[PDB]
Amino acid sequence: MQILLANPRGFCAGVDRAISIVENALAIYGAPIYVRHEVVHNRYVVDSLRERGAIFIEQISEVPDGAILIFSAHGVSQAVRNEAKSRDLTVFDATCPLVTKVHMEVARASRRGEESILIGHAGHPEVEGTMGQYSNPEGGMYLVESPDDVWKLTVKNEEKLSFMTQTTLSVDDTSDVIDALRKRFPKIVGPRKDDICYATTNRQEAVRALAEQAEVVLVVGSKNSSNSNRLAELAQRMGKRAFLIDDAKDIQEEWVKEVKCVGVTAGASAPDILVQNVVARLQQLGGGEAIPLEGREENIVFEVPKELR
Ligand SMILES: C/C(=C\COP(=O)(O)OP(=O)(O)O)CN
Ligand code: SF4
Numbered sequence: 001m002q003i004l005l006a007n008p009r010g011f012c013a014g015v016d017r018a019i020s021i022v023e024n025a026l027a028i029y030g031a032p033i034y035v036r037h038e039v040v041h042n043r044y045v046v047d048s049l050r051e052r053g054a055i056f057i058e059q060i061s062e063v064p065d066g067a068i069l070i071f072s073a074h075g076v077s078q079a080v081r082n083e084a085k086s087r088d089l090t091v092f093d094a095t096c097p098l099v100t101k102v103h104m105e106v107a108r109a110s111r112r113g114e115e116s117i118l119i120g121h122a123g124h125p126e127v128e129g130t131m132g133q134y135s136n137p138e139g140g141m142y143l144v145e146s147p148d149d150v151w152k153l154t155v156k157n158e159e160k161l162s163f164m165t166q167t168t169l170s171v172d173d174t175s176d177v178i179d180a181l182r183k184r185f186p187k188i189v190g191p192r193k194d195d196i197c198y199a200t201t202n203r204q205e206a207v208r209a210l211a212e213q214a215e216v217v218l219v220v221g222s223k224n225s226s227n228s229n230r231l232a233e234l235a236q237r238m239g240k241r242a243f244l245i246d247d248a249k250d251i252q253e254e255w256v257k258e259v260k261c262v263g264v265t266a267g268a269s270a271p272d273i274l275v276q277n278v279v280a281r282l283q284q285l286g287g288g289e290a291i292p293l294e295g296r297e298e299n300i301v302f303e304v305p306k307e308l309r
Contacts, residue, residue: 014099021070042221044270110133115155115157170230219264
C-alpha cells in the first residue's frame with residue numbers, strides 16, 4: 001500500500017512561536033513557568049512541557065504571586081489580561097498575531113458601542129478570548145455557529161453591524177454562515193472574506209487533495225484541536241474513512257487492512273515526529289516509502305519577543 005502525505009501539514013507560524021516562547025522562558029527562568037491554557041492543543045507538546053516544568057492553568061487565581069505567566073496561542077479575554085496585570089505577575093503573551101488582529105477589531109467595535117457577530121464554536125478558548133474583547137452593554141457581541149443561528153439572531157441596530165471569525169473554521173461552512181449573515185443583515189461589514197488564517201485554509205486545501213487520492217485519511221492531532229477536527233471532518237464529508245489520532249499507537253489495523261492507499265496529515269499543533277511515527281507504523285502494516293504531495297509553499301514566520309531571544 002501507498003502512503004501519501006499532505007502538504008502543507010503540521011506546525012503553523014503561531015504554534016511554532018507559542019512553543020518556542022514557553023521553551024525559552026523555561027530556559028531563561030527555570031521551572032516553574034505558568035501557562036494559561038494548553039499552549040497549543042497537542043497532548044504530546046503539553047505533556048513534554050509539563051515534565052519540563054510548565055504548569056497549565058485556566059484561571060489566574062491558581063497562579064501564585066511573583067510567577068511568570070504565558071497566555072496560550074489561542075488568546076485571552078480582556079478580563080483575563082487585566083486580572084493578570086492587576087496581580088504581581090510577569091506576563092508573556094504567546095497569542096498568535098493572527099488572533100490578535102481579530103481581537104483589535106472587536107475592541108474597536110466595543111469602544112463605539114456598535115454590535116459585532118463572531119462566527120465560531122461555543123466554549124472554545126479562542127472564542128472565549130475574542131468574545132472577551134467586547135465590553136459595551138450598549139452595543140452587543142453575539143456568537144453564531146451556523147446559518148440557523150443567524151436565522152434566529154436579532155440585534156439592536158442592523159445598520160451598524162460587523163462580523164469576525166474564529167481562525168480555525170471550516171472554509172466551506174463559514175462561507176455558508178457569511179452568506180446567511182449578508183442576506184439577513186444587508187448592511188453588515190467585515191473583512192474581504194473572513195478571519196480564517198492561511199494555515200487553516202492551506203491545510204484544508206491540502207487534505208482535500210489528499211482525500212481525492214487516498215481511501216483512508218489519518219489526521220494527527222489531539223481531540224481538542226479545532227483545526228485538526230476540521231481536517232478529519234473534511235475528509236469524512238468526501239466519503240473517506242478518516243481518523244483523528246494522537247500518535248501511532250492509536251492506529252487500529254482494521255482501518256487500513258485492505259487499503260491500497262492511505263493519506264496522512266497533521267493539524268497545526270502536531271509536531272512532525274508524530275507524523276514520522278505514524279508513517280513508521282503504517283510501514284509495519286505494509287506501506288512503502290511515504291510520498292509527499294505537491295503543495296502550496298508557506299513562508300511566514302513569527303519571531304519570539306526579543307526578551308525571550
Ligand atoms: C492557537 C490556535 C491554533 C493552533 O492549533 P490548536 O492549538 O490545535 O488550537 P485550535 O483548537 O485549533 O484552536 C488557534 N489560533
Ligand atoms: S492556526 Fe492560524 S491563527 Fe492559529 S496559531 Fe496557527 S497561524 Fe495562528
